[PDB]
Write a protein that binds this ligand. Structure first.
Ligand SMILES: *[C@@H]1O[C@H](CO)[C@@H](O)[C@H](O)[C@H]1NC(C)=O
Ligand SMILES: *[C@@H]1O[C@H](CO)[C@@H](O)[C@H](O)[C@H]1NC(C)=O
Ligand SMILES: *[C@@H]1O[C@H](CO)[C@@H](O)[C@H](O)[C@H]1NC(C)=O
Lengths: 532, 532, 532
C-alpha cells in the first residue's frame, strides 16, 4: 500500500492513508496544498495570485500554518472547536493560502463524489482549517471534505474604501480556493459539478457573502450557513471605512496623507509589526470607554465593487443572488458563553439590573447596532417581565443572540425562499460533552456546539455518550444528503420540512423534531423597532 | 442643483459647483483627479504607469498633496504666487500625480471648449498645481483650465546617465497628464483637438521641452512659455550627470558601485530620508565656496534618448520640433528680487563694486555658465559705464536676467519663427499690488509678476486697482484668444504683431503697446561672447 | 584609429583597441557588457531577466564588479590565477551579470571566428571573469574569447528544494550568457555556430552541468572541463537541501516557518547582511568539530527540475546529455597545495600518521563522501605501504585528489565516449614559474596550474622560461584547434589520441606525450569500494 499520489494543475502531490474504526478502507488525506501564491511583500492587500507550479512530487503530509492572527484567541478557538482527539501544534504565517483534503475515493479510478468545502469561523480575525479533521465526515458519508484557509484580520480585510485597497482579500481567497476545487478536485475523486460550501460563524457569513457575489458564479451548488449570515452586521462594514483604516495605519506607525500612502507603508511593515498592531487595536474586545459607534472589534467585509456590488440588504431586495439550495441555521443560545468569553464581555457577575443592562447594550453597539434612543424599548421588551437580576442577565444574552444571529438568519432564509430557491432552517439545541469545563452547565446550544456533530467528533475523540454518537451520525447524514441533493431528508432520518411559507424548520438535539416559525415574533419586534 | 458627476476612462468623478461674481452660471471644479498610479516603492525613478480603475464615484473635492519638496521654499512660493484670496493648506507626498480641472461647460451637454493645461514653475524642485485657481480664467474666457502635477527634485529628475535611471520622470508625468487630457477631457466639456500648454519658469522650460519631444506628438496645439525655455541652461544638464548622481547617492547613504546599485538603494529610502537628502544638498542655493562648475542648485532635464533625443540647441539647428503656434515671453526684471531672494543670493547690501561683481558672476556659474575668462568682458559691458555702486548692483541683476531668460527666450522664438511656425513674444512690465512687502518698490516685472494677470487674481483677491483689473482682463483674453486661434489678437485689444523678421512684440503693462527687436543687442553680445 | 563601436540587441557598445607584442593588428576589447538585468531586490533568487535596452553608446571599457563573495578568498584566488602582469582592483556587487569580450576580428567586416566562452572557477562561492585576460589567446589563436560572470554563493545557489527557490541561479546565468552569445556574438566577429564552453574547477563542473542540461540545447558545440565535472560531488547536492537552507536563513536572522517565508525574508536583507551570513557560515573551510555528514563547505548545484531533471549519475546511465566533442582533464596533484590552503585544511605539520589520517578523512566527508566504515580500507590502500609519515601525508593528498577529481573525470569521459561522442583527456603535469612562493617546490600540477598555459600568461606576465612560453603556445593551439574542429590535433603538435576503448590521453608538461588508461586502477578501486 504505497502512499496516494495525484496530479494537480500545478504538479503532483503525495498524501497519506489513514484508517478509521468501522471502515475496511482508509481515507486519503492531503495536508497543506497551496491554491495560490503566498501573499507576501507586494502581494499583501492584493488579490490572490495563481500558485507557481512545482517539479517532482510535493509532500502534502504536514499541516500548513494558520494565517497570522492573535495566537491567544486563535489557539483557544482551535482547542475549543477541534473535533480531533488531540490539539495539533499550529504555526502562524502570512504564508497560509492552503487547503486540506480528505477523500474516501479510490484514486486509481474515476470517482465523482460530492465535495463539501468548509470555511472556518473566528470573526474574520482568527481560525484555521487544520482545526477541523474531515476524516469522520468523509468516511461516514462518502464525500470529499476540503478545509480552506483565507487571509484574516488586517491581512485579509484592510480597506481604504477605494481602489488602492478595496478590501475583502480573505473573501477573494475563498473564491480562489473554490476555483482551485473546480480545476483540481476530480483528481481527488470529487465532482466539480457538486460542490457544497459550508461554514460557521464568520465562515457562515462568508458562505452568505458568496451567495451574494457574481465572482462566485459557477463555483458551488449548495450552501450551508451555520450561525452566521451576511446580515450578521458586526461582520459587514457599511458607510465610511476610511477612519478605521486610518486608525490601523496610525497604530502601525504609518502616515495617513493618502490612501496609497497608507497601503504602501503597511506593505513595508514586518509580519510581527502588523501582529503587534492587531493586538494594540484590541480586536475581539468591547470598548467600555468611548463612543460605541466608533468601536470596531473586528475588520470585516466591505462593499468593494468587485466581490460585492451593493449592500446585502439591497441585493436581497433585488433578488440578485445565487438561487442554490441553502440551509441556514442557528443554535439555541448563540451568545450563551463562547462569544462573551472570547470578548472579555462584562457580564461575569452572574446578574444584571435594568439600568446596567441599558448602558451595556449601548456599549454593545458594534455587535448589535441599536441606536441609543431604541435602547429602553429593546431592554424593556427582553428584561422587563422579571425583577430577578439573574434571569435579566440570561434574557440579555438572548437579546444579543437574537439581534446578531436569530433575526438576521431568518431574514436571509425568507428572502432566499421568496426568490424561489430551496431553503432549509434548523435550530440546534444540544450541550456537547466536548464543551469547555468553564462553560456553565445551563448553556445549551452555545455558539459552535453543532460543530462536534457535523464533523463527527464522537468518532475521533474520547468520551461521547451513545446519544451523541447517534446525534452526529444523523447530522452528518442530513448535511451530506443536502450536499448530494439540495434536500437533507432520507431514509432513517426525522422529517425536515422545507422552509416555505409555513416556515417549517428542524429542532436538532436529543429530541429532534420539526417545528414552525423560527424566531417569528423576534423578527417582527426587531425589524419594526429598527424602522423607527 | 446636484453636484457634477462625469465619466473618466478609470471611473466616475464627483466635483463641486462654485460661483464667481458677475457670472450667472457656476464653474464646475474637480480637485485631485489621478492621471497615473502613485509612483511609490519600485515605481520611483520609473515612468508613470496608468492609474488603477475605481468602482463607484470618486469624490474629487479635496486638493491633492504637492509632490515631495522643501516645504519652506515650496510653501513660500505658493504664498507668493497664488491668485486665490487665502493660502490653502497643502500636504506633501510622493503620491502627487494629480490634476485639477475648472470647467465652465454645461456637463449635461456636449461641449468642446479650448483647454489650457497649466504647468507650474519652481525650478523643477518645488511648486504645486493647487496654488493656481483656474476659476477666474475659466469663467472670464470660457476655457477649460487644467492644472497638472509632476514629480519634482530627486523623485522627478534623478538620472544615472544610463538605462538604469534615464531621468526626466517629471517630464514623462507631464506627458502622461497630456495623454489623460486626450483620453478624458471631453467628459469635462473640453476639446481634445484644442489643447494649449502653458507654464511659467520651470513650467515654461517644460513647455519648451515638450515642443522639442517626439513623445508629445499629437498632445497639444499651442504653447506658451512664460519666463523659461529649454535654452534656460540652469534647467538642462548636458555632459556628464553621473557625478551629481553619485553625490546624491552618497548624501542619501548609498554606495556608488554601479548605476543599478545607486538607483536600487535610493528606491529603498523612505520619503523622509530623500527629503532630508534634498535639504542637505542645499538645492536652490548658490555655493560661495568651491568650484562653481561643480555646483548644482537644481536637478533638471537631461538628454535621455526617450523624451529628448539630442540637446535643445541641436534640435533647433535641425528644425526638429513641433511647429505649433508658440508665444514666448519674459518679464522686464526677471532677476529683480524673487529668484535671488529664494536662493539666498549674496546681493543684499544694496550695492556692488566691480571686483565683487566679478567673483559673484563666477560663483553664479550654475545659473549663467560664463567661463572665468569671459567674466571681465561680461562685467565691463554691463557695469563699466557708471561708478555708482548702487546702479552697478542693478545692472548686475539685468546681466543675470538677460543670460538666464531674455537671450534664451529670443533665441528660441527666432528659431521657432524660422521653422515657419506662428510665434509671438511679450515683455511684461508691471508691478502687481499682490507683490510681497519685502520686495523693493523699484522692482517692476519681477519673475512671476505676470501670473496675477494671467490667472485673474484681481477677481479673486482683495485690493486690486481698477487698472490691474483691466490688465488682467486684457491678458486673460490675449491668452485665451491664442488658445482658440494661435493668434492672441481680437476686438477690444491692443494690436500684438507676429514675431516675424521685424521682431515685433508686445510690451504689456500700464501702457500696453507694440515694439520691435526685443533684446536684440543683448542676443548679439552674448552669443558672440560665448562663441569665444 | 577611432575606438571600436558595435551593435548589440540592447544597443551600441564602445570598446578599446589593445596591442600585443608580435602582432601588427590590435585586439578589440569590451569590458562589462550586461547580458541580463541586474538581479537586485525581488530579482534575487530568480532566474536572470533580459537586460533593459539603452540609448546612445555604452562605454564598455571598465571592468565590471565581481559577484558578491568573501573578498579575502576571492581576491586571493584572483591574484593566484590571473594571467595578467598586474592585479586589477575589483569591486564587489550583486550587480555582476556582465561578460568581457576579446576579439581579434576586423569589426568593419563580416567575421565568424570560433568563440570560446570561459566559465571561471572558485567553488561556486568566489571568482571573477576579469581575472582572466583573453588578449593572448585571442591574438595567438584567432578566436573570440568571452569571459562570463554568474551569481555565486547564497545569491547563486540558495535552494529551498521546492518551487519557492529552486536554486541553480548561477547556472541559469551561465545559460543566459550563452543565449546572449547566440544573439550577439556575430557583431563581435564570432561564429554563433561554433561556441566552445570551457572552465576550470567549479567552471569545469558548470561546463559538465551544461552538457547534462536541456536548457543548454543549441547553445554550444564543444566543451572543455578542466579539473572539475558534474561527478565532483562536493559541488552537487543530492538528497535533502532544506536543512542547509534553514541554517542559512537562521544565520541571516530569518524565520524558517515555510520555504516562501525564508526566501522572502532573505530577499529583504542587504547585500552586506548576506555577505556577513556567508562569512559566519565558514564556507570553503572544513568543520573539525561536529558530524561531517552535516558539514557544507559550499552551496552548489541542485537537481531543480528545470536545469537538471535528474542526478548526473542517472542522466549518464541514460545517455541523456549533449554529445558534443568534450575534452576532460585533470592535473597531476589536484590537492597538492592550492585547495587545502584555501580551506585552511589541517595538514600543515608536513606529516601524518595513519590514525590521524583516518579521522581527517572522516572530517573530509563533505569533500570525499566516504562512509565511516569504508575509511580503514581507503586509508590502508593509499598509506599502508610505507611507515614514512611524510610520504603518508603526500599519499593522503593523492587520495583526496583521486576521489574529488581523477576518478569523477575518468567516469565522465568513459560515459561520454560510450554515448558515441568525441572525447579527449589530458593530465597536466607542470610547475609554473607563476606559482605562489608559499607553494612547496615539490608540488607539480597543482589545481589551477594549467590556467597559465591556456590563457598565455607567458605572453603577458614577466619571467617565463622559454619552455613555458612554448608550453603555452602548444596548449593554446590544442585548445583552439579543439574549438575549431572538435579535435585538438594539428601540424606542429604532439599527437593527442582520442579517448576511445584504449583510453589514450595526453600527458601535458615538459615532456608532452601520449599515454593510456588514465587513473584506471583508481576508478576500479573507488567505484567498487563505494558499491559496498
Ligand atoms: C513526507 O513528509 C513527512 C514529514 O511530514 C515524512 O515523514 C515522510 O517521510 C515524507 N514522505 C516522503 C515520501 O518523502
Ligand atoms: C466629498 O468630500 C467632501 C470633503 O472633501 C465632503 O464634505 C462631501 O460631503 C463629500 N461629498 C460626497 C457626496 O460624499
Ligand atoms: C570611456 O570610459 C573611460 C573610463 O573607463 C574614459 O577614460 C573614456 O574617456 C571613455 N570614452 C568615451 C568615448 O567616452
Amino acid at each position: 500500500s504505497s502512499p496516494p499520489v495525484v496530479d494537480t494543475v500545478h504538479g503532483k502531490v503525495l498524501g497519506k492513508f489513514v484508517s478509521l474504526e468501522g471502515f475496511a478502507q482508509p481515507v486519503a488525506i492531503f495536508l497543506g496544498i497551496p491554491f495560490a501564491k503566498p501573499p507576501l511583500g507586494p502581494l499583501r492587500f492584493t488579490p490572490p495570485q495563481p500558485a507557481e507550479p512545482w517539479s517532482f512530487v510535493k509532500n502534502a503530509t504536514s499541516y500548513p500554518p494558520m494565517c497570522t492572527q492573535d495566537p491567544k484567541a486563535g489557539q483557544l478557538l482551535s482547542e475549543l472547536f477541534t473535533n480531533r482527539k488531540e490539539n495539533i501544534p499550529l504555526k502562524l504565517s502570512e504564508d497560509c493560502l492552503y487547503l486540506n483534503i480528505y477523500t474516501p475515493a479510490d484514486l486509481t479510478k474515476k470517482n465523482r463524489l460530492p465535495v463539501m468545502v468548509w470555511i472556518h469561523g473566528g470573526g474574520l480575525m482568527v481560525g484555521a482549517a487544520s482545526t477541523y479533521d474531515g476524516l469522520a465526515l468523509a468516511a461516514h458519508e462518502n464525500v470529499v471534505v476540503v478545509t480552506i484557509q483565507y487571509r484574516l484580520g488586517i491581512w485579509g480585510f484592510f480597506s481604504t474604501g477605494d481602489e488602492h485597497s478595496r478590501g475583502n482579500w480573505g473573501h477573494l481567497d475563498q473564491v480562489a480556493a473554490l476555483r482551485w476545487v473546480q480545476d483540481n478536485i476530480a483528481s481527488f475523486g470529487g465532482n466539480p459539478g457538486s460542490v457544497t460550501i459550508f461554514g460557521e460563524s464568520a465562515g457562515g457569513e462568508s458562505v452568505s457573502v458568496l451567495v451574494l457575489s457574481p465572482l462566485a458564479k459557477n463555483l458551488f451548488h449548495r450552501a450551508i450557513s451555520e450561525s452566521g449570515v451576511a446580515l450578521t452586521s458586526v461582520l459587514v462594514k457599511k458607510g465610511d471605512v476610511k477612519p478605521l483604516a486610518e486608525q490601523i495605519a496610525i497604530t502601525a506607525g504609518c502616515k495617513t496623507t493618502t490612501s496609497a500612502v497608507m497601503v504602501h507603508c503597511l506593505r513595508q511593515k514586518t509580519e510581527e509589526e502588523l501582529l503587534e498592531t492587531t493586538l494594540k487595536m484590541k480586536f475581539l474586545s468591547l470598548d467600555l470607554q468611548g463612543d460605541p459607534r466608533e468601536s470596531q472589534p473586528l475588520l470585516g467585509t466591505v462593499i468593494d465593487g468587485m466581490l460585492l456590488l451593493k449592500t446585502p440588504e439591497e441585493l436581497q431586495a433585488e433578488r440578485n443572488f445565487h438561487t442554490v439550495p441553502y440551509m441556514v441555521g442557528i443554535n439555541k443560545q448563540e451568545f450563551g458563553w463562547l462569544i462573551p468569553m472570547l470578548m472579555s464581555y462584562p457580564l461575569s457577575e452572574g446578574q444584571l439590573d435594568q439600568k446596567t443592562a441599558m448602558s451595556l447594550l449601548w456599549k454593545s453597539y458594534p455587535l448589535v447596532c441599536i441606536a441609543k434612543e431604541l435602547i429602553p424599548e429593546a431592554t424593556e421588551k427582553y428584561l422587563g417581565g422579571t425583577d430577578d437580576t439573574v434571569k435579566k442577565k440570561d434574557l440579555f444574552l438572548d437579546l444579543i443572540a437574537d439581534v446578531m444571529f436569530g433575526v438576521p438568519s431568518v431574514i436571509v432564509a425568507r428572502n432566499h425562499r421568496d426568490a424561489g430557491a430551496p431553503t432549509y432552517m434548523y435550530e440546534f439545541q444540544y450541550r456537547p460533552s466536548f464543551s469547555s469545563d468553564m462553560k456553565p452547565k445551563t448553556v445549551i446550544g452555545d455558539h459552535g456546539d453543532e460543530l462536534f456533530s457535523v464533523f463527527g467528533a464522537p468518532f475521533l475523540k474520547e468520551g461521547a455518550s451513545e446519544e451523541e454518537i447517534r446525534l452526529s451520525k444523523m447530522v452528518m447524514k442530513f448535511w451530506a444528503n443536502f450536499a448530494r441533493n439540495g434536500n437533507p431528508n432520507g431514509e432513517g432520518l426525522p422529517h425536515w420540512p422545507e422552509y416555505n411559507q409555513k416556515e417549517g424548520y428542524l429542532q436538532i438535539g436529543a429530541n429532534t423534531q420539526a417545528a414552525q416559525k423560527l424566531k417569528d415574533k423576534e423578527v417582527a419586534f426587531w425589524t419594526n423597532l429598527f424602522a423607527k
